Subunit: 246 residues, 4 copies
């Protein structure tokens, strides 16, 4: 050899054993991306479904992914805490997730965007977080869902004030400053006759991805099915105890 | 809020300041990929050029990448040592490189494989390495190029024994066991009349990527772009020819 | 300034939040230390108690230490998992523990070694371990106590063959190779009339240090078993806090 | 076994190869320590010399320490960059340095503080820093020496305004607010007739510790020359010092 010594400079990044590993992907410069490709405001079904398809491909090509959660230009994957995949090297986790997701995006672009053409290949960033207890993982997922709900409740009335009322962005943002949750709900209900609760459950709750038994003559295989329910309340977790307790 | 405290569990991964950062991408299970898509043995020009184009896209979309080096199903990118991009968070470096490369691969698949169809989206893995001195970075690049040369010198005669001689893989591997460099060179030169030195410089030396000044008219308009090369990077001549890459 | 930028090269070492931190001190080259100072075989009460006194000083001068466990030439301190001391920088933990222990050793040497003179200042090494659950911390403590018991059971009969039987170390180690627990117990009971079970509780169980009320609270020592659930059911405040 | 698996939770602390390792010890709450033991202001020779002796003991009991630098209640040790001691585990470095220093302090307390009694055992904290080039290590040592010089130049005139002038600390600090280097030097030279250059070289330059060859003669008339960590009080910011001792960096 006489050159292998450089490999000694590789630092270790093994994650603490018996701990949940979480990888969060976030699109890079996706505001400009949605701008160049005429994304629908405040929500675009094509983008959300394509993100879910990429997340399913990621869950299928890798292992030990027990749950995924997605929202506009973001996704999170939770690997099981007792995993031994890649000796718990966070670098492998995040690079595999990012590369697989980014390739699947360009691959399945056409399936969901029949009319729109992809102008350029997008970029993504990732990160790894280690959580020692089940409570902290539950709280992280609840944090993501609450962020989803708040952003959707703001953007719905913001684009209702820009599109159906003809206000510049500065005008709408000055109109919404200082409003509470029920305040925005009432602005919607009384100024546009739009009930926020009637909005699609995929816009105000995000997407969850869990293994379930499908059939397709007969194809009794497991696949990552999506859901659009609340993951902050104990009901979801008491209804699926095997995901956490294993 | 009531939930943001979970963000405290994010550990720091800042790379040592004043140090070369190197990110190496490597295709995952790429043997099966080259199998399913009828890759040419021992080398396929189309695949190598597609990897080089993805690497150029990576060098253009990101910053402070001063050099890249490529080989069969792998690439390495060297960020300048005094960089401050993303506060030197290795996570950002590697995820950005991996994602950009993997998306550019699927995008530009058609440009080089006009007939061949992509069956599935490929996966890639990455890693970060910190090198404190110019000598260590030079030695890492020399290691990659020497590995390239040895693998190509082996695979050339290995596939020459299977294709042009009709030997099963076990037979070719048993015939090549114990051979040296000159041994394989002589087997090739005397049993197949193939001179290894005349082989394409992109197969036995890899690919290097450096910023150079390109002229493009339609006037003599000019701009900088990442050009490829296939020269030796182990000898000081290459570095004496481009001093701006290390001393900046 | 023009020089402060070097401070950027300090790496971060924050321990994972909501996790038990454990610092284990172990004396360096303490074989030669016990050799030059004529330590009692197989155990010396003065030395073990001095280690306990240093550990108490460490528990009092620092914070969030809920328990300590000690044995021949080693000690361990468990900081509470929800601590925020020094922003959970492991470096501060280990350097403070090591320095305080090493200073207290030389300080309180005379109290326990009135006749003996300290020949040189000893050295110590440390380390930090992060445990995510109570079960792993319990298992670590049980590991330490089992190591204590096995080492004491071996050394008792090992020095009994050297002192009361006149055998060289090689002879005793060749005689003890392959013996089980009941094997050593029977060799002791039948060759020296020494019952291992009757041995002092500080030699075959180690030492535990926990806060208790005398009127203010102070770290009292104990010599009971910490592997059995009874110990933890007797002290619920240390685990659930 | 059945319990050793917990050892898997031990994290690694390997230092970057081919890099200078630096351990800096700093006394904990040493303001209160110097207060309770009646330390001399602005500088106390006993404390500084005892710290230097502890640092020498640390340099002798451990290995691969090529240089040490000391200042008020602080010290720094530079291990050789190509070291392999303890497989470059920073924890071992820092814990060994801290424990040895803290024990040597209490041990040799009496040798330098014969009259003063040690009230309690002091505590110390440390840290590890990895430097990739010789320039960064040189700059770190120069940073420490410049900090020493600035603190001593400030404290000299500060305690001259408190002790020989009768000013409260808040008043003296408000009087010193906004003063430059030449300002403090001129206040000292013209209001107290103290020339800063005449001050002891150990106060305005710190302390350096380097291996040098010591000669020594024993009983029975035989002379033996062995290596020992000698102290110095010279400038380490100027290139002259490094040109005079090239073996410390180039090895």
């Amino acid at each position: 050899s006489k050159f292998e010594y450089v490999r000694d400079f590789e630092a270790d990044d093994t994650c603490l054993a018996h701990c949940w590993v979480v990888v969060r992907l976030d699109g890079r410069n996706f505001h400009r991306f949605a701008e160049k490709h005429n994304f629908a405001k405040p929500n675009d079904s094509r983008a959300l479904q394509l993100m879910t398809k990429c997340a399913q491909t990621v869950m299928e090509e890798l292992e030990d992914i027990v749950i995924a959660y997605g929202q506009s230009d973001e996704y999170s994957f939770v690997f099981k805490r007792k995993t031994n995949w890649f000796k718990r090297r966070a670098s492998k986790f995040m690079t595999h997730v990012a590369s697989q997701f980014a390739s699947s995006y360009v691959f399945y672009w056409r399936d969901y965007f029949e009319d729109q053409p992809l102008l350029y290949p997008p970029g993504f960033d990732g990160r790894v977080v280690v959580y020692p207890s089940n409570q902290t993982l539950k709280d992280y997922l609840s944090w993501r869902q609450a962020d989803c709900h708040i952003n959707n409740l703001y953007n719905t009335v913001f684009w209702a004030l820009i599109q159906q009322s003809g206000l510049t962005p500065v005008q709408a943002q000055g109109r919404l400053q200082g409003t509470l949750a029920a305040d925005k709900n009432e602005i919607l209900f009384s100024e546009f006759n739009i009930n926020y609760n009637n909005e699609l459950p995929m816009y105000r709750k995000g997407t969850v991805l869990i293994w379930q038994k499908v059939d397709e003559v007969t194809r009794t295989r497991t696949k990552p099915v999506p859901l659009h329910c609340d993951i902050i309340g104990d009901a979801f977790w008491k209804e699926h105890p095997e995901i956490l307790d294993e």
